[PDB]
């Protein structure tokens, strides 16, 4: 059989052969000619004006064996240009003689699990965010941070939903093998421009809302400590307590019985607003979750427009300007793992010291937060610097492309673990089911 990976490894060597030759090869000394370029399909030399440039068919192709010698054409005009046919598209090429497989059977399969994995996640996340916003019993400091982490993934999932639309948009022009390849190019110049930018911001927002999630989990564990309310906003002074209802002065909310309601409004003790400081500190959490990603995504986009905006800013060969997005995301990952490590240090001590129970919201969330932090930043720490050392983070980025076609689900993972797995929404599930029968 033909492999879906080896066919790309051979393609990577076809671009190596191409790049090597279109840089090693001497100029024609004709002055007026048509430039040597790589179609992202075939390797083309310099064309003599007024000649049919016939090239051998790419060997990375699976069916390359069935179509030997090769007959993929292009025409150099007297003007010094490659024949156009349609200028809003790529120049005329005749891939007619080189057409029809196992690697594209695996390619379509990889794309199918990628889009269904994204449709699955987005739906789960949108319905999940609808669970926390629909139910009033959940309008609390904690869930607000989740809804923002949902948002960054939701925008990222509708970001891939916009790029795929441009992919289906240009391909519905007609029916042709060359056009299929051409439709990719016409969209690789225009639609790709703004979407891939917002996508890069979304990803930056995932990792940074993961940071504040871990930070909020640290604050929820490092917390004399006082509390408040989310409904009416009553502040429960623990140093003052509430003996007028049966709680002596100098008692923490953690030691108030569950059979308790707010003295002002009357809502349950399960609707406590955490430490009275949680309110304003959320503004910072937003400032860290969205603010910081802007602080390095627009600098990158700016220079990826003032210096190299050719080919949807995807080609990063001349200079490593992509560090403007990698290093801050790597920084987030190192502290997300440092939070992860410190959280376990505290929980084990707090549990053993009897100062904390597994039944708590802080532990229930720890189970979830300590699960996202490891998987979502794992790859972005080991490779980040180790691979950066040499030109083999080159072939690792081809593997990351394949990863991204499996990391489509990582949106649903956030949805389940932070909503579907929540013991509180499960009580709301039981309340809604009981309200019918």
């Amino acid at each position, epitope marked *: 059989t033909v492999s879906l990976w080896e066919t790309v490894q051979k393609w990577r060597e076809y671009r190596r052969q191409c790049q090597r030759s279109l840089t090693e090869d001497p100029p024609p000394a*004709t*002055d*007026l000619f048509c430039n040597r370029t790589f179609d992202e399909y075939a390797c083309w030399p310099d*064309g*003599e*004006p*007024g*000649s*049919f440039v016939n090239v051998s068919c790419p060997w990375y192709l699976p069916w390359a064996s069935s179509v030997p010698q090769g007959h993929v054409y292009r*025409f*150099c*005009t*007297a*003007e*010094g*240009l490659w*024949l*156009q*046919k*349609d*200028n*809003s598209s790529l120049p005329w090429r005749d891939l007619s003689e080189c057409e029809e497989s196992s690697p594209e059977e695996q390619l379509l399969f990889l794309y199918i699990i990628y889009t269904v994995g994204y449709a699955l996640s987005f739906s789960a996340l949108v319905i999940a965010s609808a669970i926390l916003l629909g139910f009033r019993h959940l309008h609390c400091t904690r869930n607000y941070i989740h809804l923002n982490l949902f948002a960054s993934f939701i925008l990222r999932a509708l970001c891939v939903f916009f790029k795929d639309a441009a992919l289906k948009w240009m391909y519905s022009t007609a029916a042709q093998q060359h056009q299929w390849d051409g439709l990719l190019s016409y969209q690789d110049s225009l639609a790709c421009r703004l979407v891939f930018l917002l996508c890069q911001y979304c990803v930056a927002a995932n990792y940074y809302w993961l940071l504040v999630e871990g930070v909020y989990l640290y604050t929820l564990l490092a917390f004399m400590k006082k509390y408040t309310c989310t409904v009416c906003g009553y502040i429960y002074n623990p140093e003052d307590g509430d003996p007028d209802n049966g709680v002596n002065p100098g008692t923490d909310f953690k030691d108030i019985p569950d059979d308790w309601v707010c003295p002002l409004c009357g809502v349950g003790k399960d609707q406590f607003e955490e430490v009275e400081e949680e309110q304003w500190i959320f503004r910072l959490y937003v400032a860290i979750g969205w603010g910081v990603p802007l602080l390095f995504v627009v600098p990158w986009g700016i220079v990826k427009y003032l210096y190299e905006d050719e080919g949807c800013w995807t080609r990063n060969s001349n200079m490593n300007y992509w560090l403007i997005i990698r290093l801050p995301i790597l920084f987030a990952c190192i502290v997300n793992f440092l939070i992860f490590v410190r959280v376990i240090c505290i929980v084990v001590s707090k549990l053993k010291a009897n100062l904390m129970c597994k039944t708590d919201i802080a532990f229930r969330l720890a189970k979830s937060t300590l699960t996202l932090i490891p998987l979502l930043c794992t790859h972005e720490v080991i490779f980040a610097f180790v691979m950066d050392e040499h030109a083999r983070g080159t072939l690792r980025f081809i593997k990351l492309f394949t990863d991204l076609s499996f990391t489509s689900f990582q949106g649903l993972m956030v949805a389940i673990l932070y909503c579907f797995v929540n013991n509180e929404v499960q009580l709301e599930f039981r309340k809604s089911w009981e309200r019918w029968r």
Partner: antibody
Framework: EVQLQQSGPELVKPGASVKMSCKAP????????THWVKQKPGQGLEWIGY????????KYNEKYKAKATLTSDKSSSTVYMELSSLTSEDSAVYYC??????????????????WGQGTSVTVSS | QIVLTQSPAIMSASPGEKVTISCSAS?????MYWYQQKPGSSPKPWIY???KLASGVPVRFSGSGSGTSYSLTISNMEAEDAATYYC?????????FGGGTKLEIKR
């Protein structure tokens, strides 16, 4: 033998601008770029520049930059050459020509086969 | 930029005499192109790729050249061949033409 249907003759005052048409019955899939050539008696024959109609991007002779302005019509598929700030030096016949290829297999066998009638310009007060 | 200089200015030949029009370029070009323009019409491709003849051109005409120095020649000269002949370069931009050589017929 004229195939390119060009515009009529023009009498323009010095300092003005003239914009002439070059309607082609239809651009060949092989030749679509129209070249403009200046024939001023005694000056010989001068290639002004060309206009790529598929991308509306034109090539100019450095001599005729900020003098000629080459544009193309999408619908009618017609080339246009504007001549700003005109003087006596600009009174000439103006052709629009397209390359006709002899043997596409071999490189360099071509010539400005498709010629226009020629739009004469008289720059006089 | 590159300059095409073609000598003589006007050439007068009796029928059946050898006509030979030159065209020396400034910089060395690959191929030379010639156009026959008859007073009263637009120019016409006459010789392409230095020595190749355009369709309908009689075999008396022959293009010859290399580097900078090129020429157009006629053997069995005939009055039909009286016109201005422009050499052209397609090798570089801007595309240079020749001054033209008006050919007349001695009698």
């Amino acid at each position: 033998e004229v195939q390119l249907q060009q515009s009529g003759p023009e009498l323009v005052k010095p300092g003005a601008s003239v914009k002439m048409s070059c309607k082609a019955p239809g651009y060949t899939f092989t030749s679509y770029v129209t070249h403009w050539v200046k024939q001023k008696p005694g000056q010989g024959l001068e290639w002004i520049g060309y206009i790529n109609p598929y991308n509306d991007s034109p090539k100019y002779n450095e001599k005729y930059k900020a003098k000629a302005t080459l544009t193309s019509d999408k619908s009618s598929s017609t080339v246009y050459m504007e001549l700003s700030s005109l003087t006596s030096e600009d009174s000439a016949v103006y052709y629009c020509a397209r390359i006709g290829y002899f043997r596409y297999d071999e490189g360099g066998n071509y010539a400005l086969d498709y010629w226009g009638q020629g739009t004469s310009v008289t720059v006089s007060s | 930029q590159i300059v095409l200089t073609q000598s003589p200015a006007i050439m007068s030949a009796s029928p059946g005499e050898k006509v030979t029009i030159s065209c020396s370029a400034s910089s060395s070009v690959s191929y030379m192109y010639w156009y026959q323009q008859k007073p009263g019409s637009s120019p016409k491709p006459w010789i392409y790729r230095t020595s190749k003849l355009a369709s309908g051109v009689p075999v008396r005409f022959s293009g010859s050249g290399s580097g900078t120095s090129y020429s157009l020649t006629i053997s069995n000269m005939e009055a039909e061949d009286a016109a201005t002949y422009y050499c052209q370069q397609f090798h570089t931009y801007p595309w240079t033409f020749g001054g033209g050589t008006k050919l007349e017929i001695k009698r």
